[PDB]
Write a protein that binds this ligand. Structure first.
Ligand SMILES: CCC(=O)N1CCOc2c(cc(-c3cc(OC)cc(OC)c3)cc2C(=O)N[C@H]2CCCN(C)C2)C1
Length: 117
């Protein structure tokens, strides 16, 4: 019927896919902590980005058992990517780095999602 996932199983299976993103340098650097619009010059950020997401938040959600099923994790990774592509200019470091992370993530996540069902 509905498949139940234990938080420790999700963490064991999915954390390596997150670690693959963290390992990218310089590409993960903009994504390791939440965007701070006041520190940066950018008070329009949260006008445009309604649901912020970043690697530290996704990690915390895996660590604290906030995901019930693996597609919720995938959706947060993609939310992070889509926010960055929505806000940032195509020539920017953040935009290009986002694209690299999306390439890495795609390769990592597919066999893991097959394994989890
Ligand atoms: C997902 C992140 C995100 O979408 N934002 C929103 C855009 O703002 C940036 C963010 C991160 C980085 C950034 C780039 C890095 O490259 C190596 C490393 C990094 O390591 C923490 C952060 C750069 C910018 C940026 O556009 N800076 C401009 C703004 C206007 C003013 N001039 C001077 C700076 C945060």
């Amino acid at each position: 019927r509905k498949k139940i996932f234990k938080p420790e199983e999700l963490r064991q299976a999915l954390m390596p896919t997150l670690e693959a993103l963290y390992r990218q340098d310089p590409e993960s650097l903009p994504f390791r902590q939440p965007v701070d619009p006041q520190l940066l010059g950018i008070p329009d950020y949260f006008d445009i980005v309604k649901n912020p997401m970043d690697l530290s938040t996704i990690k915390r959600k895996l660590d604290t058992g906030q995901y019930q099923e693996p597609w919720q994790y995938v959706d947060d990774v993609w939310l992070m990517f889509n926010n960055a592509w929505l806000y940032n200019r195509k020539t920017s470091r953040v935009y290009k780095f986002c694209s690299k992370l999306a390439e890495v993530f795609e390769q990592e996540i597919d066999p893991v999602m097959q394994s989890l069902g």
